[PDB]
Design a protein around this ligand. Structure first.
Ligand SMILES: CC(C)(O)c1ccnc(-c2cccc3cc([C@H](NS(=O)(=O)C4CC4)c4c(Cl)cnc(N)c4F)sc23)c1
Ligand SMILES: O=P(O)(O)OC[C@@H](O)[C@@H](O)[C@H](O)[C@@H](O)CO
Length: 585
C-alpha cells in the first residue's frame, strides 16, 4: 500500500510493558534515548535541575563497563584519536596544498567554527599560514542563526566541500554529526572516500555505527549508516577514521547541542591540540598527551559545577523574567560572547522561543556605545542581563555597561573567569552581590595565546549557559518528562523524532501514529495516497510553517478523534501543556 516503503524502516510500537523485551529500547539511538536520570526533569526544582544536568554532563567522562559500548576513555577510542593526530601531523609538515576542514549542521557546525578559529589563531601566533577551515550547513550565516532545515541535503554538503577544497592536494575532512545522522555530512564523507588520493575523512559522533541513521536521503543513494560502515572498513588501512564514543543520553532527549556539542569540543580540541604540541617536539602524539588534556577538561566539569548553587539562582531569575513576558540578555566578550549568541539562538528551535526571549551580544555584534545607545534604552524592572567575561578582558568596557544597565534593571548577574590570584576591581565587584566566578588553577602551557585556557573557559561557559537556558524553560513547564514534545518539524530527523515521540506517549501502532501526524501536518487537506507516499521533505516543508502540530497529533490519538476536534479542545484548554498532561491521564 502507499507509505509502506516510506515508513518500512520505522520500528513498530511495542505492546505495553514489552518496550524492553521486543528489543525496542536496544534499538533507540543513544543520542535519542530518554536519560533515566532525567525521567522527572519536569518535576525538579531549579537546584535539582542543575544537579541532574551536571550529572548528565559527567557521563561524558564515565568509563566503559565490562557486552557494551566504547567510551571516551576506552582504549580503542584513544588509539583512534592518536592515529588521527598522526594524520593531522603529516598535513602540518606539508602546508602547501594541505587543508583541514571541520564540518557539520546546527550546533555541530557552530562547534566546528569556534575550533577552526582557535587553531588558525595558534598557527598564526606562531607565524605560519592557517590551514583550518569550517563548513556549516546553510553557509556561514548558519553559524549564528537558527536554520534547522539546511542539514538535509547531501549535495549541498558535497558542494561546499568541493568549494573550499579546490586546488588543494591533501585534505582532512572532519565531519561532525552527533547522531551520525546529518545528510550534509554523509555526502562529504562519501565524496572523500571516492577520492582518497586527496581526501582523508574522519567522522565524529556519539552513536555506535550500528545505530547510525539508516533513512533514505532524498538527493543521494547511500544512507548515513552505509557510509559510516564503509569508513569503518577503511580504517584498517588508515584511510578513514570513525571516532564515535558513547557519552550517554542527553538530559533533554535528543538535544544534542548539550553533551554532544561539549563532547565534540572536548574530543577534537584534545586531539588537535595534542597534534600541534607534539609536532614541535618531533615526537609521535601519544595516548598520554591526550590523557592530560582529557583529564583537564574533566576537572573543568568539576570546577564549573562547584558553582552549582549560583547556577541555579541565575536560572530562577532567567525563568521568572521569561514567565512575565520579559526578555533575557547574555552579554559577553570575544569568544564567550559568541557562545552566548549561539546559546540564545538555539532556544528558538529548541523551545519554541522568540529570538528576543534569550539573546546574546558580543562586545548580534553590537559593541560599547552602540549597545548603550541601541539596546540599553528599552529595558525593564523584570528583564535579566548576564555579563560573561574574564579578568583578562577590557574591564573598563565591562564596568561602563554594567553601570548604565544597573539603573534599567536590578536582575544582573555575572559569569567571571579568573586564574587564581587575579582579583576584581571593586567598582565591578560591588555591582554583583552573588557573582559566579570560576577561578582556574595555574597550569603549565606551551603556546602564547594559552589555548588550553580558552578551551576550558569556552566549555565551562557552554555548560553554564546550556544548563541555564534549558532548565529555565523546564521550570516554565514546557518539557514533558525529559522530552520536548512541542517541537517544530524543520528537518527529517525532527520528523522522525516527532513520530517516535507519538509512539512513545500514545502507545499506539505506527500506522496510527503516522496517520495522525500526517493529518495534523497537512490539515485541512485530507490524507490522499500522494501525501502518504510523499518524500519526508514534503511533510517537513508544510509542518515547518505550523504550530502545535505534534500535540494536535497526540490529542487526536489519545481521544480517538479528528484533527478538527483535537484543535477545538486544545483551544479550550488553559495551555498546550495543561491539555497534553490532562489527556495523558
Ligand atoms: C525515546 C523515543 C521517544 O522512544 C525515541 C525518540 C527518537 N527516536 C527513537 C527511535 C527508536 C527506534 C529507532 C529509531 C531510529 C531513528 C532514526 N533513524 S531513521 O531516520 O533512519 C528511521 C526513520 C526512523 C534516527 C534519528 Cl531520527 C536520529 N539519529 C539517528 N541515529 C537515528 F537512527 S530514531 C529511533 C525513539
Ligand atoms: O550533530 P547532528 O547529530 O548531526 O545534529 C545537528 C543538528 O541537528 C543539531 O546540532 C541541532 O541543530 C541541535 O539543535 C540539537 O540540539
Amino acid at each position: 500500500m502507499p507509505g509502506t516503503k516510506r515508513f518500512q524502516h520505522v520500528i513498530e510500537t511495542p505492546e505495553p510493558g514489552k518496550w524492553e523485551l521486543s528489543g525496542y529500547e536496544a534499538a533507540v539511538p543513544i543520542t535519542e534515548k530518554s536519560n533515566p536520570l532525567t525521567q522527572d526533569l519536569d518535576k525538579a526544582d531549579a537546584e535539582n535541575i542543575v544537579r541532574l544536568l551536571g550529572q548528565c554532563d559527567a557521563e561524558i567522562f564515565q568509563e566503559e563497563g565490562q557486552s557494551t559500548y566504547q567510551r571516551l576513555y576506552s582504549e580503542s577510542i584513544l588509539t583512534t584519536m592518536v592515529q588521527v593526530a598522526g594524520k593531522v601531523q603529516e598535513v602540518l609538515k606539508e602546508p602547501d596544498g594541505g587543508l583541514v576542514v571541520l564540518s557539520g549542521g546546527g550546533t555541530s557546525g557552530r562547534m566546528a567554527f569556534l575550533m577552526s578559529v582557535s587553531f588558525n589563531q595558534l598557527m598564526k601566533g606562531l607565524g605560519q599560514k592557517p590551514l583550518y577551515t569550517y563548513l556549516i550547513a546553510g553557509g556561514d550565516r548558519s553559524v549564528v542563526a537558527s536554520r534547522e532545515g539546511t542539514e538535509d541535503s547531501a549535495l549541498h554538503g558535497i558542494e561546499e566541500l568541493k568549494k573550499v577544497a579546490a586546488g588543494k592536494k591533501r585534505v582532512i575532512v572532519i565531519g561532525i554529526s552527533v547522531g551520525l545522522s546529518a545528510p550534509f555530512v554523509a555526502g562529504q564523507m562519501d565524496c572523500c572516500m571516492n577520492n582518497t588520493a586527496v581526501f582523508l575523512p574522519v567522522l565524529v559522533g556519539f552513536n555506535p555505527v550500528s545505530m547510525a541513521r539508516n533513512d533514505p536521503i532524498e538527493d543521494w543513494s547511500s544512507t548515513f549508516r552505509q557510509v559510516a560502515e564503509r569508513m569503518q572498513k577503511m580504517q584498517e588501512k588508515q584511510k578513514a577514521f570513525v571516532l564515535n564514543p558513547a557519552i550517554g543520553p542527553e538530559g533533554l532527549s535528543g538535544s544534542s547541542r548539550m553533551k554532544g556539542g561539549s563532547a565534540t569540543k572536548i574530543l577534537l580540541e584534545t586531539l588537535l591540540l595534542a597534534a600541534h604540541k607534539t609536532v614541535d617536539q618531533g615526537i609521535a602524539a601519544s595516548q598520554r598527551c591526550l590523557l592530560e588534556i582529557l583529564r583537564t577538561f574533566e576537572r573543568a566539569h568539576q570546577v564549573t559545577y562547584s558553582q552549582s548553587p549560583k547556577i541555579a539562582t541565575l536560572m530562577k531569575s532567567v525563568s521568572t523574567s521569561l514567565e512575565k513576558k520579559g526578555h533575557v540578555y547574555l552579554v559577553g566578550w570575544q569568544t564567550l560572547g559568541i557562545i552566548a549568541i549561539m546559546d540564545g539562538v538555539e532556544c528558538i528551535h529548541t523551545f519554541g522561543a522568540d529570538f528576543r526571549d534569550v539573546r546574546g551580544f558580543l562586545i548580534f555584534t553590537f559593541s560599547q556605545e552602540d549597545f548603550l545607545t541601541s539596546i540599553l534604552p528599552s529595558l525593564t524592572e523584570i528583564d535579566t542581563v548576564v555579563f560573561i567575561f574574564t579578568l583578562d578582558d577590557n574591564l573598563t568596557e565591562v564596568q561602563t555597561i554594567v553601570e548604565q544597565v544597573k539603573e534599567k534593571t536590578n536582575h544582573i548577574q555575572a559569569l567571571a573567569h579568573s586564574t587564581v590570584g587575579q582579583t576584581l576591581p571593586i567598582p565591578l565587584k560591588k555591582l554583583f552581590p552573588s557573582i559566579i566566578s570560576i577561578t582556574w588553577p595555574l597550569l603549565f602551557f606551551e603556546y602564547e595565546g594559552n589555548f588550553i585556557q580558552k578551551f576550558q573557559r569556552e566549555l565551562s561557559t557552554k555548560w553554564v549557559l546550556n544548563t541555564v537556558s534549558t532548565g529555565a524553560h523546564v521550570l516554565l513547564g514546557k518539557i514533558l518528562q525529559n522530552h520536548m514534545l512541542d517541537l517544530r518539524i524543520s528537518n527529517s530527523k525532527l520528523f522522525w523524532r516527532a513520530l517516535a515521540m507519538l509512539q512513545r506517549f500514545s502507545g499506539q501502532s505506527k500506522a496510527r501514529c503516522i496517520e495522525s501526524l500526517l493529518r495534523a501536518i497537512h490539515f485541512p487537506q485530507p490524507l490522499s495516497d500522494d501525501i502518504r507516499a510523499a518524500p519526508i521533505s514534503c511533510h517537513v516543508q508544510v509542518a515547518h510553517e505550523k504550530e502545535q502540530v505534534i500535540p494536535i497529533a497526540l490529542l487526536s490519538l489519545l481521544f480517538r478523534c479528528s484533527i478538527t476536534e483535537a484543535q477545538a479542545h486544545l483551544a479550550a484548554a488553559p495551555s498546550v501543556c495543561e491539555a497534553v498532561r490532562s489527556a495523558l491521564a
